[PDB]
């Protein structure tokens, strides 16, 4: 849905996500998986302060 | 086959309306109706099925994501094209519970998708236009309310 | 002296703001027929927006 | 009349300035248009007196104005663009009366038909409908 | 058939991008900026475009701004191919910073077709909509596809199949997916209690937005808008008094509206003291 490839902030994400877990996700998640694998997400933060990811 | 959808030469619009395409899709719909995981749920969607056609109900309804796991691009396809992929999804669903319960269309003859738990929300000051011809979920009140009409017959509000 | 100096930089504050008054007429304005009447009418709305209107 | 002294301004430019070698700013004078307006005729009748036999007659009147509509623009020349090789025409109008090219003008191109007006290309000119009392 | 080459226009596209290459470097970098956030319309202001060519290009694009419009999209379509294709493989323009503003009983029928500026209280504001912009149809004759049909402020078919298999004229459906529509809304300004003598009347006029401008004129705002000015189909004029003009026959009557590409609402020290010299 986005023209360009530039990821969306993590404080869109993670509402958008916790609604499908039926369960409040939060940003230290997101750590817990970036420890299992570390190429999982490219994890660039934005020039605005908000946390991205991104495939 | 599966993979072969992903490789588009056209737009997502276009690759879908393509024959070979249509049908490629509608075998792993088909596929996926039937087969999936939720480990100690197993399989929910043939429960869905079973209780769908003990009720004779004209509401299919699937979730979102279950979709995108067994299917990674068939439930992304579905989101950019809802149109499209929901014309479809009307047959493999007439199909595929028809594997489960034959003779369904001797009563029903047609079966209308509903989706649920669409996960993106918009609001309607959101309402961009690279979000037009696509599926979008939004929140609101009823203010005005129409009655019921058949429409060229078919219910209408 | 002290009035002196108070008329002194009075008129350099219209001395100084006329640079900004004939791109007023250049612009859009198109005929000798424009009388002092119609065309003072006219600056004073074009600045009384401004930070810094004129009478 | 007014025909009459706007080849009159155009004479006396002639005659009074360059003749006259005095100067000769007066290039542009001779393609702008002059219109001379009587307003002191002598006093008329008014509104209730008036009769048919005074048409086309120029009269004098007082009165209040009530109503102004706004300026209304008015054609005076037609702008038309071929719709299949975009060529441009100009158009006047000759007694309130707008000619549509039914062939487009051009030697190649003679398509019937093949004419299309352009509404803001136009020039207009200025109409103003005031109500007197 | 090669077409009629309009030598003003191109040689106001080579002026135009070449503005857009050269000038001091925001407009190289509010394109970027469109391209990060999915923008749609880029604003130039005009203090800028007067400091090229001496000011001529400013009032060339400035007295003629409906006719040279469509040279300025084909401008920066270029660039941004030349230097954001995806914004390209997602369109308009907004000018402002007019250094004269024309009151109202300044509309007058010599200036239509060119760029100005106005002042005007605003009155009402109807609710937006959206305006279709580019059309396509499917002939009927045949499958055949016509695109990129430009409407002009008037519903505009197509007036011949481009096969030369089919013969078709003046039938068409219209397209409502590869058709592309823009938001319109109408806003009616009024006359300022300053601009006119005291004692007498206000007039009014009715304004267009299109675009991002929409929404942004608020009922006892004092707006200002700038844009250019326009005729529109207008059936009120029939009736008066006075020789009506006839084509052949149909009537040609019209009334004069403003459509404006920019929308500003006018009513900190530092902010204050950086706007005085
Ligand atoms: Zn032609
Ligand atoms: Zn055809």
Redesign the pocket.
Known sequence: SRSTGVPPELHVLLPQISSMMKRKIVQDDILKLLTIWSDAYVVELNSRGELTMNL | LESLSNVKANSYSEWITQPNVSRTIARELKSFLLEYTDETGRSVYGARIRTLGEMNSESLEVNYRHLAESKAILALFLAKCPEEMLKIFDLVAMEATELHYPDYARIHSEIHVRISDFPTIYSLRELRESNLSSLVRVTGVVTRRTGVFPQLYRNYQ | ALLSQRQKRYQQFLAMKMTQVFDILFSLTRGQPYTETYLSSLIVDSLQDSNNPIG | VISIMDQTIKDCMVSLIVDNNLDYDLDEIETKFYKVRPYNVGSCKGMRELNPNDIDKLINLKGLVLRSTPVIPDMKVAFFK?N??D?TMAVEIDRGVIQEPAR?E?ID?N?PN?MSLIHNRCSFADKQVIKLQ | VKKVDDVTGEKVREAFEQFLEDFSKVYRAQIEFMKIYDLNTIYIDYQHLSMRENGALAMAISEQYYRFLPFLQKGLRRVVRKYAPELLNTFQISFFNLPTVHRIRDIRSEKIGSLLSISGTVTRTSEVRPELYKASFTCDMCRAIVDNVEQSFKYTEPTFCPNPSCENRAFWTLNVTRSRFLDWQKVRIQENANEIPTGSMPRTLDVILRGDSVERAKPGDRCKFTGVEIVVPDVTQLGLPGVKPSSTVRDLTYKISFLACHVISIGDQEVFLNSLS
Do not use: L, M, T
Request: with cysteine.
């Open positions: 071929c299949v090789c060529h487009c051009r191109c398509e093949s």
